[PDB]
């Protein structure tokens, strides 16, 4: 099956395939990057000068040979970043609605090519995003991503059509403690590389400022602090920053009016007059739904903040809670969008694990309303400080952000695991299955849990539990085997290193689970001698588990083994 990720809005596969000659000839004028992409891919074919055909164009080009050729398929792709992609048996058309659309068209093409002959299936794809902003924020506490990780992350975003990176590292003082101060000389090449890499990838580099700890609003100092703010933003503009955010999350000041005013002035006196600068982004003091309401009434801060703030300023919130245990429903978002008189942006606190750092979140974006896009214009993933380990969840986030209507968590998770773990995808999922739930997320190993819950009812009733024991034994044997196989074969070694303690603990859980079954079986067999021995071995395995810091399988398997003892 043809597989494009994120899942395209509209895709129809054709009957035939075709192959490519060693010469191509591309007709198109076109986005530098979309075009340089097309090239690097062909050369991974050559460009002929005369008469197989590949027409790559944006709508702003109104290119003749392209628009003419594309008569067979009709265009109601209107949204920004939308594109159409056609292949037929031999022409291939890459028509965006814009420079980004054309880039994404090529990204989808790059996933169509099967390489030996080099074939390219025939399809019509009509495609565009559910959310206009699909971002990752560096918003965890703990050790920041390194330069290599950041660059690596940015490239992944462009690959999967995420269009923004919010640079908000808690430990970088020039975003916060020293917000007034421009970036030193030493830092400039570091930042430009980020910005340039983001630009080449159609990823908005968003610079976040958190002035809230000491900013002044009142009088002479207010005017100074405001000038400081304008200046800093000018610096960043000079580096190439075209997207900005001012954050009030997690500070002292509770003046909604003054904060909104600072934002409106900045929006007025900086944003709208600077060329290519995108809408300002903010986050309130009351950034979770429940913080915004006292019963049915809107709280003072939110009332003043929302009433004062210009409607074209984007506002992030986290859902009903800081970490919503059961995702975010359309009605949750409606309640907040009604107060703010605008589509909200969802800052989604998963896979971030900074509040539970010994457990990795390796599951799909889960329990977010399929039709959130009705009230929400932005989807923002807050990842773990562990970059490679964050990728699986983040990619499901890319899929949801791009195509929320057709997003299915489990099927999406399968594809992300395949992207990240390759040939080891089955072994990886067996592991990741036990590591999805933190304060939010898909519940861990749900079938195993049902098996156990069902087992205990039968056990208390003295009914035969052979099928369940058999089922559990299969699971536990896989748990025993997958760590060595992953340690041996997982190609992503940063990922392997991040997970190594978890994998070792997982192997011991497998063994402890196998022993727990034996203990249960001993009781059924009324074999007092065998029971004593197994019980003793089981206590030792429990001790081995308790000695390892890493948290995995802690909601389902762990209580099972402890209940048996």
TrEMBL record:
Belongs to the glycosyl hydrolase 84 family. The active site is at residue 250. The lineage of its organism: Bacteria, Bacillati, Bacillota, Clostridia, Eubacteriales. This is O-GlcNAcase nagJ. It comes from Clostridium perfringens (strain ATCC 13124 / DSM 756 / JCM 1290 / NCIMB 6125 / NCTC 8237 / Type A). Residues 132-405 form the GH84 domain.
